[PDB]
Design an enzyme around this catalytic site. Structure first.
Site, PDB file in Angstrom:
ATOM      1  N   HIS A 243      27.540  -7.211  -6.851  1.00 56.03           N
ATOM      2  CA  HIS A 243      28.706  -6.916  -7.671  1.00 56.03           C
ATOM      3  C   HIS A 243      30.000  -6.780  -6.851  1.00 56.03           C
ATOM      4  CE1 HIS A 243      30.625  -5.653 -11.379  1.00 56.03           C
ATOM      5  NE2 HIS A 243      31.107  -4.577 -10.784  1.00 56.03           N
TER       6      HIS A 243
ATOM      7  N   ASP B  49      23.662  -9.276  -8.659  1.00 53.68           N
ATOM      8  CA  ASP B  49      24.388  -8.113  -9.160  1.00 53.68           C
ATOM      9  C   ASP B  49      23.436  -7.163  -9.904  1.00 53.68           C
ATOM     10  OD1 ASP B  49      26.152  -6.289 -10.274  1.00 53.68           O
ATOM     11  OD2 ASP B  49      27.729  -7.813 -10.420  1.00 53.68           O
TER      12      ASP B  49
ATOM     13  N   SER C 274      33.625  -7.283 -14.006  1.00 54.23           N
ATOM     14  CA  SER C 274      32.886  -6.081 -14.300  1.00 54.23           C
ATOM     15  C   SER C 274      33.268  -5.679 -15.718  1.00 54.23           C
ATOM     16  CB  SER C 274      33.276  -4.998 -13.304  1.00 54.23           C
ATOM     17  OG  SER C 274      32.393  -3.894 -13.372  1.00 54.23           O
TER      18      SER C 274
END
EC number: 3.4.19.1
Length: 560
Positions: free
Chosen positions: A535, A503, A424
């Site tokens: 995600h 994602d 991330s």
């Protein structure tokens, strides 16, 4: 191994839990013995329940990782029988709470983030929130909450259950970290200032920000610096879980409670005995009792994955701006000193590396890699100042600090080589560290990474569109020069790009143009696109999915 997060009580005093158990996240009922399943299919989360209600609000991914949630009301008496609250288009539920008569919650779509109200009349939009916003509590016709509306700052947002609406309460001091309504309908929040942290009594009518005072002063002596979560119990006692330097403390009416070393959060009143959800660098999120500390819920954790760490240390790193970044160390018994070392940056960034359970930190130290989990500026738990330092300066000081942890290691005599790994925002860091500092490390793993602000912008919902503007002070020229894609003519060390196809946080689209870019300027790299994955991991599996390719890439380096 299995994990259990605290949700709250329902069925009277039948503890409600959620488990990362058997390759699936499932809502669960616990009565002090044999856990009972509710959901049919692997869920994603379960809306905050309001004590003792006879039904649960499952949150399911109907898009396979993409984050578009569908809501199901599973009556607790009938485990496995679900009703898809059809008067709610699948979307991104950031949070909600169910009271048994109606469900409110926050959802963000292409066009907007808003607070929703599902009662016995159909769908209703309560109020449109500026950007990421969360439902902290509801009491009466009241609606207390939090929202990232400006400056990486957190605000207090209040709405209504019927007329709806919203007024936002700010603090020049700092941001809010959690709230919960009280008898006096005055929002008991926790003000996190660049300074320290404490409680306040933000009143809805005029927005009074008086200081809240508690009978016992332990909490008022613990000198908390960042309140994890707080909220009243049915008896009437204000449950406060503060924390400082990665470790937290249970406080009831100021009255400190002895609890397992590490981290907790939501505390509940089950059968009149306090209960929270522990987690330590060595102990995976679990649900125990207090203060005895016995675990009610914990999953069979091996004695070797806990033996795969020779130790832990909170060292404080010298940053370029002379800032000290509180870093988390983890010796990998299966490695020497110094030895191969990976710098594991937490994502968020408004997150942090505390004395809590990190599956990457474990596996890593298990792979013979000591770990460095720094709380760069932007991180949480270290004051409103360190966290708001990143806003507008993504890939700047933090990176430096993220580089200052790296610095430490070699000179600290623990790193024979250094690699940076992240997911991330952490994936994003793996990319800036490599483009802005094509030398610091030996290699970089980026997952569910951020490679282009301007595209991630043109591919994001109202929640995420706003988030960026903030982290860059509302300036394109940052989404330009702070996006590694435009800095691909400068990368030198290898790089593995682990990425979930669906994602919707860090899309794949811009990540595929990055690979294609790398291929032009022929850079050494390897790509990993996981299928039907978003995600986060709504299965026990996808943990190892984006953590299997990583280690090989990271061990292929090992041997030069």
């Amino acid at each position: 191994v299995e994990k259990y997060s605290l949700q709250g009580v329902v069925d009277g005093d039948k503890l409600l839990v959620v488990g990362f158990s058997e390759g699936s996240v499932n809502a669960y009922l616990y009565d002090g013995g044999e856990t009972v399943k509710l959901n049919r299919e692997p869920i994603n989360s379960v809306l905050d329940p309001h004590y003792g209600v006879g039904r649960v609000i499952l949150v399911r991914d109907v898009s396979k990782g993409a984050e578009q949630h569908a809501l199901f009301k599973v009556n607790t008496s009938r485990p496995g029988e679900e009703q898809r609250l059809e008067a709610v288009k699948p979307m991104r539920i950031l949070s909600g709470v169910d009271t048994g008569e109606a469900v409110v919650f926050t959802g963000a779509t292409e066009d907007r983030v808003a607070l929703y109200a599902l009662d016995g009349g159909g769908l209703r939009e309560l109020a449109r929130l500026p950007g990421f916003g969360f439902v902290s509590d509801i009491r009466g016709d009241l609606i207390a909450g939090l929202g990232f509306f400006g400056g990486g700052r957190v605000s207090l947002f209040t709405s209504n259950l019927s007329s709806g609406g919203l007024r936002v309460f700010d603090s020049g001091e700092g941001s809010f970290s959690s709230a919960s309504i009280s008898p006096g309908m005055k929002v008991t929040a926790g003000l996190e200032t660049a300074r320290e942290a404490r409680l306040v009594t933000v009143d809805p009518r005029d927005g009074s920000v008086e200081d809240l005072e508690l009978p016992s002063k332990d909490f008022s002596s613990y000198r908390p610096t960042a309140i994890t979560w707080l909220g009243y119990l049915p008896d009437g006692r204000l449950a406060v879980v503060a924390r400082r330097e990665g470790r937290s403390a249970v406080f009831i009416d100021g009255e400190r409670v002895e609890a397992p070393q590490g981290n907790h959060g939501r505390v509940v009143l089950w059968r009149g005995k306090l209960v929270t959800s522990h987690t330590s660098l060595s102990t995976p999120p679990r649900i125990v009792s207090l203060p005895s500390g016995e675990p009610l819920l914990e999953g069979g954790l091996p004695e070797d994955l806990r033996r795969s760490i020779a130790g832990s240390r909170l060292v404080w790193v010298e940053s370029f701006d002379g800032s000290r970044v509180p870093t988390y160390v983890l010796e990998s018994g299966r490695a020497p000193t110094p030895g191969p070392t990976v710098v594991l940056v937490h994502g968020g960034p408004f997150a942090e590396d505390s004395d809590s359970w990190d599956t990457f930190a474990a596996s890593l130290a298990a792979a013979g890699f000591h770990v460095v989990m720094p709380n760069y500026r932007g991180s949480t738990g270290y004051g409103e100042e360190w966290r708001l330092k990143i806003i507008g300066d993504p890939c700047g000081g933090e990176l430096e600090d993220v580089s200052a942890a790296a610095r430490w290691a070699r000179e600290s005599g623990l790193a024979s080589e250094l690699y940076i790994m992240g997911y991330s925002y952490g994936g994003y860091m793996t990319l800036c560290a490599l483009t802005m500092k094509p030398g610091l490390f030996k290699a970089g793993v980026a997952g569910a990474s951020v490679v282009d602000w301007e595209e991630m912008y043109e591919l994001s919902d109202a929640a995420f569109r706003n988030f960026i503007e903030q982290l860059t002070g509302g300036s394109r020229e940052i989404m330009r020069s702070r996006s590694p894609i435009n800095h691909v003519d400068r990368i030198k060390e290898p790089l593995a790009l682990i990425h979930p196809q669906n994602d919707s946080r860090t899309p794949l689209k811009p990540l595929l143009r990055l690979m294609g870019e790398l291929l032009a300027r022929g850079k050494t790299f390897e790509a990993h696109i996981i299928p039907d994955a978003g995600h986060a991991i709504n299965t026990m599996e996808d943990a190892v999915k984006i953590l299997l390719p990583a280690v090989f890439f990271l061990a292929t380096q090992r041997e030069r």
